[PDB]
CSV table of C-alpha atoms in Angstrom, one decimal:
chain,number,residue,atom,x,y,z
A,1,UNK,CA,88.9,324.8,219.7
A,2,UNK,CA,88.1,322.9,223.2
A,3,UNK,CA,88.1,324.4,226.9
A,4,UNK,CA,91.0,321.8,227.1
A,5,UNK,CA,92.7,318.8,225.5
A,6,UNK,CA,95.1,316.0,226.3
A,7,UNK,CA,97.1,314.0,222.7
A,8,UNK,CA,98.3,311.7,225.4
A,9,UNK,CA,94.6,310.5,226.6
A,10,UNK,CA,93.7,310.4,222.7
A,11,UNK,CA,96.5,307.9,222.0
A,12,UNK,CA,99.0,309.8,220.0
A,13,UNK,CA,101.3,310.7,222.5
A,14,UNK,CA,104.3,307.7,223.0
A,15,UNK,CA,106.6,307.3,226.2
A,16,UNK,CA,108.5,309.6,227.4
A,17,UNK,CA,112.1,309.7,226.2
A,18,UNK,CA,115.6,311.0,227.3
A,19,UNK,CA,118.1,312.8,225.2
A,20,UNK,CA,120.7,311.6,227.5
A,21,UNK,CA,124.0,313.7,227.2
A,22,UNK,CA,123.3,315.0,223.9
A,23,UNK,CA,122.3,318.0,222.4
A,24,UNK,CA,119.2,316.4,220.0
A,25,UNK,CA,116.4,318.3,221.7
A,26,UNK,CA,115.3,319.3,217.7
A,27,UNK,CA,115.3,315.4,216.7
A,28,UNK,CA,112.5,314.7,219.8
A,29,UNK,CA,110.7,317.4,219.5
A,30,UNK,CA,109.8,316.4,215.9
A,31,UNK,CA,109.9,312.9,216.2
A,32,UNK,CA,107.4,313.6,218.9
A,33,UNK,CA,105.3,315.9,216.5
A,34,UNK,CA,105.8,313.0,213.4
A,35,UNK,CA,104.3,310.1,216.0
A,36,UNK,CA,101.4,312.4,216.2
A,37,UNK,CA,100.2,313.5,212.9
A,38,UNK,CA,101.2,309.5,211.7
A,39,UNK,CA,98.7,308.0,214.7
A,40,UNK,CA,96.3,311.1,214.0
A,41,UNK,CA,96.2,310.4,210.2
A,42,UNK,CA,96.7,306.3,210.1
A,43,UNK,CA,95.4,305.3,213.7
A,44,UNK,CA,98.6,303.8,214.7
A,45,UNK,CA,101.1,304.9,217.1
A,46,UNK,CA,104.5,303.9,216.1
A,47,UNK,CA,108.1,305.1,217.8
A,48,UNK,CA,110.0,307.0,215.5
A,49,UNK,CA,113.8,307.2,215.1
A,50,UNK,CA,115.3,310.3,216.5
A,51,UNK,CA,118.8,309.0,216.1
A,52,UNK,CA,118.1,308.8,212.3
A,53,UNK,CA,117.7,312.6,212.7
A,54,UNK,CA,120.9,312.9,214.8
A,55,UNK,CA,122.7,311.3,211.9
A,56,UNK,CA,121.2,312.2,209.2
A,57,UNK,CA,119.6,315.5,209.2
A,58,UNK,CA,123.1,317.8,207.5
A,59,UNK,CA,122.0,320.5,208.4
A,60,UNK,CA,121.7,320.1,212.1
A,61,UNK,CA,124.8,319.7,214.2
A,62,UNK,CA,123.7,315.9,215.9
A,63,UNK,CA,124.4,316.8,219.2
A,64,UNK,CA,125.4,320.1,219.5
A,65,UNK,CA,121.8,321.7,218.5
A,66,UNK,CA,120.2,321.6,215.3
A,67,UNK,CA,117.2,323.0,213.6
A,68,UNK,CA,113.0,322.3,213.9
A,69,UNK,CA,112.6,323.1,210.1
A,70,UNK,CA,115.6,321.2,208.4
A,71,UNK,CA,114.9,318.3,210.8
A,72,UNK,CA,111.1,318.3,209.4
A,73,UNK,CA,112.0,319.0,206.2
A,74,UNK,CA,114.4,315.6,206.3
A,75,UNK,CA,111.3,313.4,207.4
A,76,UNK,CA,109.0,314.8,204.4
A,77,UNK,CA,112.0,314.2,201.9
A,78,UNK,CA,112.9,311.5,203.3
A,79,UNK,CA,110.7,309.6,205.9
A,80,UNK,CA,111.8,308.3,209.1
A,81,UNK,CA,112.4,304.6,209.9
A,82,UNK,CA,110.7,303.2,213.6
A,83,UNK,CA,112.8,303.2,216.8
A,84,UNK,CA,113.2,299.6,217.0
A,85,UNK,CA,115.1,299.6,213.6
A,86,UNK,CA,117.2,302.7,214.2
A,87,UNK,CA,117.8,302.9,218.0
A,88,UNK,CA,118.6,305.9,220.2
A,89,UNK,CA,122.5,306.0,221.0
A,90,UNK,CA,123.0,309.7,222.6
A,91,UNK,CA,126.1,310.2,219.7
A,92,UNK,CA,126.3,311.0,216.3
A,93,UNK,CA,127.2,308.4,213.9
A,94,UNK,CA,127.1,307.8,210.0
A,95,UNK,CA,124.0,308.1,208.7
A,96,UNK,CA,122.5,304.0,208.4
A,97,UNK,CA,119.4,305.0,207.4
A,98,UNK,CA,119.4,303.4,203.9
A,99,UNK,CA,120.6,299.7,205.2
A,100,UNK,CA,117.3,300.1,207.3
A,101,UNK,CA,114.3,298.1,206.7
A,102,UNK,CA,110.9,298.4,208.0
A,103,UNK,CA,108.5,301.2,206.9
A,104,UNK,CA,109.8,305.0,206.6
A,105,UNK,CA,106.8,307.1,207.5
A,106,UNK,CA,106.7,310.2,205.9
A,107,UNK,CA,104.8,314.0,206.3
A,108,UNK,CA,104.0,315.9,203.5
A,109,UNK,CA,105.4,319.0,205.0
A,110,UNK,CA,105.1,321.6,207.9
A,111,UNK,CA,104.1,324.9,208.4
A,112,UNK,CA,104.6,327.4,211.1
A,113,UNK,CA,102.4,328.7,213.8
A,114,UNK,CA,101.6,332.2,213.8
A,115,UNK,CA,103.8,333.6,216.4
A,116,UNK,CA,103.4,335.4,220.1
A,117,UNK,CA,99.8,334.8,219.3
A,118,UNK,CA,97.7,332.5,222.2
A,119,UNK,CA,94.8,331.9,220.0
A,120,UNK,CA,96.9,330.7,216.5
A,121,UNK,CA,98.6,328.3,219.7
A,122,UNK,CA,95.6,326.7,220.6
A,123,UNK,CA,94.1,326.9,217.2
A,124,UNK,CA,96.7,324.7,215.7
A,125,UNK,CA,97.3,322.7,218.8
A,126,UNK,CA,93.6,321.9,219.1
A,127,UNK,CA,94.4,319.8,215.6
A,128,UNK,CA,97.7,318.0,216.7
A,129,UNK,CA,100.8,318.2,218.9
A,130,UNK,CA,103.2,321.0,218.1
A,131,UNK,CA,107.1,321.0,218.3
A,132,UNK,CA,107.9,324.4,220.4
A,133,UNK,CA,110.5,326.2,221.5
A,134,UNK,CA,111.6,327.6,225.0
A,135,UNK,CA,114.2,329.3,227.3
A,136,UNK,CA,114.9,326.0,229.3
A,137,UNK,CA,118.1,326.7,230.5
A,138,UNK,CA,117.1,328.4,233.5
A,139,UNK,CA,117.4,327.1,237.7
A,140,UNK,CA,113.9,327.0,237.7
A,141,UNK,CA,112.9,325.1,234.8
A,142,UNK,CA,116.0,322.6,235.4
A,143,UNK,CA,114.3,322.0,238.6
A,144,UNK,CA,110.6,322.3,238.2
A,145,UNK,CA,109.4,319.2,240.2
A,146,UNK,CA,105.4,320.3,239.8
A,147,UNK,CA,102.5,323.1,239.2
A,148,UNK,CA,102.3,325.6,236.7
A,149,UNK,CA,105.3,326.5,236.1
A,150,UNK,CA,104.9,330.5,235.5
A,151,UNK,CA,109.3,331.2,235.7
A,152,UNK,CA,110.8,332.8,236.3
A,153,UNK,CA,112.3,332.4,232.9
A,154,UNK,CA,113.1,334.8,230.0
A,155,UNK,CA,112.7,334.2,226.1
A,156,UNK,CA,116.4,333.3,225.2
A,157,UNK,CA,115.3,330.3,223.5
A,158,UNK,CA,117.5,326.9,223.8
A,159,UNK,CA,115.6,324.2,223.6
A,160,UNK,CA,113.1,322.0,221.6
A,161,UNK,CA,110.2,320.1,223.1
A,162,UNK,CA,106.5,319.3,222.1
A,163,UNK,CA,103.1,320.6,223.4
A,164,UNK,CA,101.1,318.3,223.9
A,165,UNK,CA,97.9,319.4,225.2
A,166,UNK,CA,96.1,322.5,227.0
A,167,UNK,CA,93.4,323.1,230.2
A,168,UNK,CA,93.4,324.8,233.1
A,169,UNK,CA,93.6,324.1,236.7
A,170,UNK,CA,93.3,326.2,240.1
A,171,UNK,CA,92.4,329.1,238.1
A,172,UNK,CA,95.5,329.4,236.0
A,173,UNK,CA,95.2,328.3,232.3
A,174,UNK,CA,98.4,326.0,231.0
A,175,UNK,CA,100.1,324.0,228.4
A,176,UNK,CA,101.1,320.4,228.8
A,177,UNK,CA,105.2,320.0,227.1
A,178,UNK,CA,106.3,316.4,226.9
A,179,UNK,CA,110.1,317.0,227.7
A,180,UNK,CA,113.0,314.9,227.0
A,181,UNK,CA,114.8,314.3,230.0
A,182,UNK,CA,113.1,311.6,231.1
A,183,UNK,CA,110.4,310.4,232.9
A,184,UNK,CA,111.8,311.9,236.4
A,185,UNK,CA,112.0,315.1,235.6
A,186,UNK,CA,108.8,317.6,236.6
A,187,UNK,CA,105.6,315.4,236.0
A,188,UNK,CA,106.5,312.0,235.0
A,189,UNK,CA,108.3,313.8,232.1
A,190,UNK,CA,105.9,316.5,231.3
A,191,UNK,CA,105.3,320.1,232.4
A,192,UNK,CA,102.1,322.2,232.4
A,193,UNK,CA,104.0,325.9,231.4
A,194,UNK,CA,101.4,328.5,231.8
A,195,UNK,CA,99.5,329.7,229.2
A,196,UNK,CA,99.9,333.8,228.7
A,197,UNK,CA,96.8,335.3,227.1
A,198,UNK,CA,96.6,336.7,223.5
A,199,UNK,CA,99.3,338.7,221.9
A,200,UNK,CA,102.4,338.1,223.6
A,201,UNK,CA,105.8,335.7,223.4
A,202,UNK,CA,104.9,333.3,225.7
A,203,UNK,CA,106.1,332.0,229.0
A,204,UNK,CA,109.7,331.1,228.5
A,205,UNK,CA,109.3,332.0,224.8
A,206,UNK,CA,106.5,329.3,224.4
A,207,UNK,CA,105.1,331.4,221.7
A,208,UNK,CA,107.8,332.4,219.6
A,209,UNK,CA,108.8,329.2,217.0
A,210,UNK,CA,106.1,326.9,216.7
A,211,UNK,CA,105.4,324.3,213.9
A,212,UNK,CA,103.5,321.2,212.8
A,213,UNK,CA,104.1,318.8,210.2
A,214,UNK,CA,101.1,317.7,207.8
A,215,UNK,CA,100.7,314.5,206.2
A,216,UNK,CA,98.2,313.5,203.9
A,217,UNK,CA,98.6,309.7,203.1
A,218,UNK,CA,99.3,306.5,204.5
B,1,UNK,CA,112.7,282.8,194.2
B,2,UNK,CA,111.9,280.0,196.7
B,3,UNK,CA,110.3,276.9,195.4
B,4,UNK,CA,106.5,277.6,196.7
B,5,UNK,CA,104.7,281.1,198.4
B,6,UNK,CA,101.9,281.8,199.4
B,7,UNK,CA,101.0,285.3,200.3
B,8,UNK,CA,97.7,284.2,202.4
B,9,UNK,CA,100.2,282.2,204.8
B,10,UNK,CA,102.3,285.5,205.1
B,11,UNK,CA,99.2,287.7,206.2
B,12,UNK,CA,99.0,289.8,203.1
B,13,UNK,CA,95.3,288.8,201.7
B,14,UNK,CA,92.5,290.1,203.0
B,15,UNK,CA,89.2,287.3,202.6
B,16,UNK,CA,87.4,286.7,199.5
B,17,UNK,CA,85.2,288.8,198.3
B,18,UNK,CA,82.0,288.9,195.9
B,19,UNK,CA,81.9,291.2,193.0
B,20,UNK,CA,78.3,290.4,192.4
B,21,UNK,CA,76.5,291.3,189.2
B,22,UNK,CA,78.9,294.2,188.3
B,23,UNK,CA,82.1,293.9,186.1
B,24,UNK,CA,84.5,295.4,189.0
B,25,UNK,CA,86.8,292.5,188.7
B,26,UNK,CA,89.7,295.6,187.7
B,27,UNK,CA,89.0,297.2,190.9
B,28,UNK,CA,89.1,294.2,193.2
B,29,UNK,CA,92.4,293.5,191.2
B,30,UNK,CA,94.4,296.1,191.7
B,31,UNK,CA,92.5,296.7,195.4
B,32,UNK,CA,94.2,293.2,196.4
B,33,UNK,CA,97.7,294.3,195.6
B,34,UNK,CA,97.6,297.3,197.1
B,35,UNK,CA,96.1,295.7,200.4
B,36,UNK,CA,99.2,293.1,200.0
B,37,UNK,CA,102.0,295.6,199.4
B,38,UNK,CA,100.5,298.2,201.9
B,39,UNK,CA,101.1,294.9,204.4
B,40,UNK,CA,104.3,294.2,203.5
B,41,UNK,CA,105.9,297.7,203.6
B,42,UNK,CA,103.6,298.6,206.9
B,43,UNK,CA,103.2,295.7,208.8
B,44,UNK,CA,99.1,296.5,208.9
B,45,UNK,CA,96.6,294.4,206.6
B,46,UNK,CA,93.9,296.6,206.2
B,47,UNK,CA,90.7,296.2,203.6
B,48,UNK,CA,90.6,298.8,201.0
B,49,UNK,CA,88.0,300.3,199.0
B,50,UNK,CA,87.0,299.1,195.5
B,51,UNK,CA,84.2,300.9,195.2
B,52,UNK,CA,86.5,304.2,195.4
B,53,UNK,CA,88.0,302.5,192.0
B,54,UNK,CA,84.3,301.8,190.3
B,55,UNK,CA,82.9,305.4,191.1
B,56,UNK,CA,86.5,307.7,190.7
B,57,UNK,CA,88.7,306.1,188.2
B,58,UNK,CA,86.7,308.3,185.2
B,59,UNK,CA,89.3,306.1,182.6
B,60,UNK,CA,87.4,303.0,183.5
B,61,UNK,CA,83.8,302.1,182.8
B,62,UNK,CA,82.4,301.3,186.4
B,63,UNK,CA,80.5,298.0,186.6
B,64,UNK,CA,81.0,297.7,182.8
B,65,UNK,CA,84.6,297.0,182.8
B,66,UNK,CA,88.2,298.6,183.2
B,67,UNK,CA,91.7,299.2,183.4
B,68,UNK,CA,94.7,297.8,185.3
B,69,UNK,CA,97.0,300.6,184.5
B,70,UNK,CA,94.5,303.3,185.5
B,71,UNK,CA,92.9,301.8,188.2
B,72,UNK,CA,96.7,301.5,190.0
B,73,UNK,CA,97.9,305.1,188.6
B,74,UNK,CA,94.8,306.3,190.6
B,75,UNK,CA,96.1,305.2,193.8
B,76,UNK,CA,99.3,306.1,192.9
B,77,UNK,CA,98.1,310.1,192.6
B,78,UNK,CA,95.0,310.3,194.7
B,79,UNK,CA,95.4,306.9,197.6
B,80,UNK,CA,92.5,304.9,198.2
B,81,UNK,CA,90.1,304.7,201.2
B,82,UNK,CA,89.4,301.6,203.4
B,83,UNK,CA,86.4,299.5,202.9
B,84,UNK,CA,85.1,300.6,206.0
B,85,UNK,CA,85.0,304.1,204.9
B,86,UNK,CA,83.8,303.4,201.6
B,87,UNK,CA,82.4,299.8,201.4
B,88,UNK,CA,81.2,298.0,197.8
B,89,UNK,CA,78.0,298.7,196.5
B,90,UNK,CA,78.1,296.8,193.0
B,91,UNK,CA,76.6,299.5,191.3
B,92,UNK,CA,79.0,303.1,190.0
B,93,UNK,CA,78.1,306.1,191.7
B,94,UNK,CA,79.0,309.3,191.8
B,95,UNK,CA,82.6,309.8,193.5
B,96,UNK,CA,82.8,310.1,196.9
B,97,UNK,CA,86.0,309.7,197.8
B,98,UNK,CA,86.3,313.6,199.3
B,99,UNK,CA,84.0,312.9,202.1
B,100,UNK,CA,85.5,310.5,203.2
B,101,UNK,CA,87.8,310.5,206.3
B,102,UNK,CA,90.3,308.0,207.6
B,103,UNK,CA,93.6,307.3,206.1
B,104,UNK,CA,94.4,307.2,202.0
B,105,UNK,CA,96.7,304.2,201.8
B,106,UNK,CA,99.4,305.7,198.2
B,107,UNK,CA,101.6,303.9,196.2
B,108,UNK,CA,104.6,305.2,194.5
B,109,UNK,CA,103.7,304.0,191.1
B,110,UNK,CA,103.6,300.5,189.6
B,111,UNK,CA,105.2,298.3,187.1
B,112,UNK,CA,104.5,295.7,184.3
B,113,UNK,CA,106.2,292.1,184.5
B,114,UNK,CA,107.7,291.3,181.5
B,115,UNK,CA,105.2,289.6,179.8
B,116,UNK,CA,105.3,285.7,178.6
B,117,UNK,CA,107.8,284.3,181.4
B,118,UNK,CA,107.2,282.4,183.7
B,119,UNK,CA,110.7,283.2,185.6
B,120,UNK,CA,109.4,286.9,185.2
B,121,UNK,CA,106.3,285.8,186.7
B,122,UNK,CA,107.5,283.9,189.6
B,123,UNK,CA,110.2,286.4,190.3
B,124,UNK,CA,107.7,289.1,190.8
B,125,UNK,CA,105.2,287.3,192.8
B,126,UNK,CA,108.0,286.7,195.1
B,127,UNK,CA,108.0,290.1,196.0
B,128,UNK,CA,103.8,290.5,196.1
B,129,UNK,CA,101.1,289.5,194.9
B,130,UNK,CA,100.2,290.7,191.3
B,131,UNK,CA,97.1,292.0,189.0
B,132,UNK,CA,96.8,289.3,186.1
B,133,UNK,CA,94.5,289.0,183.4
B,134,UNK,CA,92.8,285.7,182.7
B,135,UNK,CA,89.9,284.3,180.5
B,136,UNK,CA,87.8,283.0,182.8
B,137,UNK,CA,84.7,283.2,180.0
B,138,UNK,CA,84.4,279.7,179.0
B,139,UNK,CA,82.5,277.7,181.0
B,140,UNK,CA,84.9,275.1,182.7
B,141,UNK,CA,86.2,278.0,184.3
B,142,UNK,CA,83.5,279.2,185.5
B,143,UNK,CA,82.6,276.1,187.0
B,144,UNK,CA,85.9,275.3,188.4
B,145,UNK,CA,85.4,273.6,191.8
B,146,UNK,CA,89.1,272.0,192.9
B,147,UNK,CA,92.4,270.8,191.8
B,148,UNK,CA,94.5,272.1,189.5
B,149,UNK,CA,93.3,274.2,186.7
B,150,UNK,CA,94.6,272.9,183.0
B,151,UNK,CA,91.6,274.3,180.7
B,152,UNK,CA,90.3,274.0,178.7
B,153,UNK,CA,90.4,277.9,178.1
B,154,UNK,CA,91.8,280.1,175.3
B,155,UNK,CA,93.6,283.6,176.3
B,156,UNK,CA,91.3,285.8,175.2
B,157,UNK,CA,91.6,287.9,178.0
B,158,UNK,CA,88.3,288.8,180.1
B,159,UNK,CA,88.8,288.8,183.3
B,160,UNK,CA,91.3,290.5,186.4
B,161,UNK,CA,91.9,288.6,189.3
B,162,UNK,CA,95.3,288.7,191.5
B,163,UNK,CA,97.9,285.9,191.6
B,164,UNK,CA,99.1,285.6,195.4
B,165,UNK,CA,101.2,282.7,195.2
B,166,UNK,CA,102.5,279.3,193.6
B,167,UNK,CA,103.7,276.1,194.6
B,168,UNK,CA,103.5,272.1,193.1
B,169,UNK,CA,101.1,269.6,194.2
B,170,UNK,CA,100.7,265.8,192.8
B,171,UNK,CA,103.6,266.4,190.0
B,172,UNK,CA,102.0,270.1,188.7
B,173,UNK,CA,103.1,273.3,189.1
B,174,UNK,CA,100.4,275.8,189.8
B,175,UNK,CA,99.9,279.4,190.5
B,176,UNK,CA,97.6,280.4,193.6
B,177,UNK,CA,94.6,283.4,192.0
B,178,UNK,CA,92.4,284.8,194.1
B,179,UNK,CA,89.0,285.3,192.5
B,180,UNK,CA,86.1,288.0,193.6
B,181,UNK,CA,83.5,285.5,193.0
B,182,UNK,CA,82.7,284.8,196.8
B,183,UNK,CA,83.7,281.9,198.7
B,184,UNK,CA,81.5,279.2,197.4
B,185,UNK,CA,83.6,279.5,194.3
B,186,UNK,CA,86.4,277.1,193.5
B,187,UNK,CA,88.5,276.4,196.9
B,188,UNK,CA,87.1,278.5,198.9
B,189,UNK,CA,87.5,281.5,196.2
B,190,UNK,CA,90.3,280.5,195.1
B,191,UNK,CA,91.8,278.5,192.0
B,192,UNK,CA,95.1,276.7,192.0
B,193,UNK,CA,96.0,277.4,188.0
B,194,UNK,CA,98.3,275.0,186.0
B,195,UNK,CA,101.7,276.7,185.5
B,196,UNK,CA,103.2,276.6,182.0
B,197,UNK,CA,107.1,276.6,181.6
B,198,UNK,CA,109.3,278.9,180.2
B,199,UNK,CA,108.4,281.6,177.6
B,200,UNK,CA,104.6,281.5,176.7
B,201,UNK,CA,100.8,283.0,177.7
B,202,UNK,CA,100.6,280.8,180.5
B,203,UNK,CA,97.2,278.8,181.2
B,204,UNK,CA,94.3,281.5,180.2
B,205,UNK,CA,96.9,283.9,179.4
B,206,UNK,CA,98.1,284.3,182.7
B,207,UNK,CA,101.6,285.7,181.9
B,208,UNK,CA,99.8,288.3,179.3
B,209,UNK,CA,98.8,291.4,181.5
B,210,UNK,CA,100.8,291.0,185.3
B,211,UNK,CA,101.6,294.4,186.8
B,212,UNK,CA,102.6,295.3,190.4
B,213,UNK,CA,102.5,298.7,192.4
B,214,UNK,CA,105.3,299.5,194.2
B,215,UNK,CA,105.2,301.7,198.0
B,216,UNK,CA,108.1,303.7,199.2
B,217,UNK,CA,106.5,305.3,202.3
B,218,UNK,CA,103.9,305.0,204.8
């Protein structure tokens, strides 16, 4: 893999978002991951519905937490339909996703990251963005404004987000996350979470529950 | 269905192209439906490869003829490659689809159209354009240059071509085909075709052979 790279400069990273009030942390982080392999594989970056997720994913609990595999799993059952035709509404309704037009883009599946492992990390994220978890619940990572965030934070992982990238700056190697809260929060949305070397969890748990889906036609 | 359609006017048609001196006509065939009905489920008109069809579908004979049936099952189990990718040759070689990058572009499956109708015909091509068989043998079709098509012709079938639309002109009902003879032939590579009523062959046996493939994803 590269010193370094950036999904956002290469085109398959879309807007920053914002859960709002609502516990769907697992429905961005893998429609973030699903808008990546689809540009990656087809060329085109399209927004994907995260509230189809929030409604329709059965296994997950809308917006009181849910899951990174059943919500992956849903999108290479089922697809997922664009943003535009299934908006973001911060609540769990019905599931609409069958009086929905437009194309459903589906994966063919996902696998898992080797865990607490830096070089499986950047391996697989070296290929496309990845949907991560991490202890976010913490002062400091509620606040981070800037930097490398290094914690302090521990491993009790509660939330879902989506790496995006990898380099290093100032001496200290990091990971770019594309949050969900927002384009205000830390750097226009992101964070660059440093990067703990080889065999080991992970800042804030970074390393512990990492996937990808795959997708092999358009 | 409406009255008239015409799949050009609705973005779904890529230009005409030119088999040359190689009896592909299957490939460009079932290539032009898949290019229409991968633009109407997706949005994106893209131009895909025929010459994927002539070297890799093994149940056809190349540049010495083939299939409708397994010339669409093909893309509906391995995808097809854009032209770009994989551009036309007019001569079979070995496959090469495996070396090729950039997206596969799958159908689900396909269907026949009930054969001998021309409200089965019309109701289909409502939805997309179709894969038709025609004789196009005898020589006034062959040196067809404008106006409606009547014959004469028999319906010995010879000859695949794709049917992307219909309509009535000067008191005649026709049926838009889109050959892969170039440009220069007909108007402007295409050939407005006489429609016949009700239950028969239709004009070159144009009701004989029609299927469709059908997409449920991107």
């Amino acid at each position: 893999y590269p010193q370094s790279i950036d999904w956002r400069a290469k085109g398959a990273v879309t807007p920053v978002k914002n859960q709002g009030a609502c516990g769907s942390c697992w429905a961005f982080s893998t429609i973030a991951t699903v808008e990546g392999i689809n540009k990656i594989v087809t060329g085109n970056l399209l927004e994907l519905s995260e509230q189809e997720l929030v409604d329709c994913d059965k296994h997950s609990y809308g917006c009181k937490g849910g899951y990174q595999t059943t919500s992956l799993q849903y999108v290479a059952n089922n697809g997922v339909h664009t943003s535009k035709v299934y908006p973001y509404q911060a609540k769990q309704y019905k599931c609409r996703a069958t009086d929905k037009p437009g194309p459903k883009v589906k994966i063919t599946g996902y696998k898992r990251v080797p865990s607490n492992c830096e070089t499986s990390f950047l391996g697989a994220l070296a290929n496309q963005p990845l949907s991560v978890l991490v202890e976010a619940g913490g002062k400091p990572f509620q606040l981070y404004k800037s930097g490398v965030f290094d914690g302090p934070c521990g491993t009790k992982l509660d939330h879902a987000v989506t790496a995006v990238g990898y380099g290093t700056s100032d001496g200290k190697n990091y990971i770019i996350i594309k949050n969900s809260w927002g384009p205000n929060w830390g750097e226009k949305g992101y964070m660059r979470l440093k990067r703990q070397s080889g065999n080991s969890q992970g800042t804030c748990g970074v390393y512990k529950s990492s996937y990808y889906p795959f997708k092999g036609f358009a």
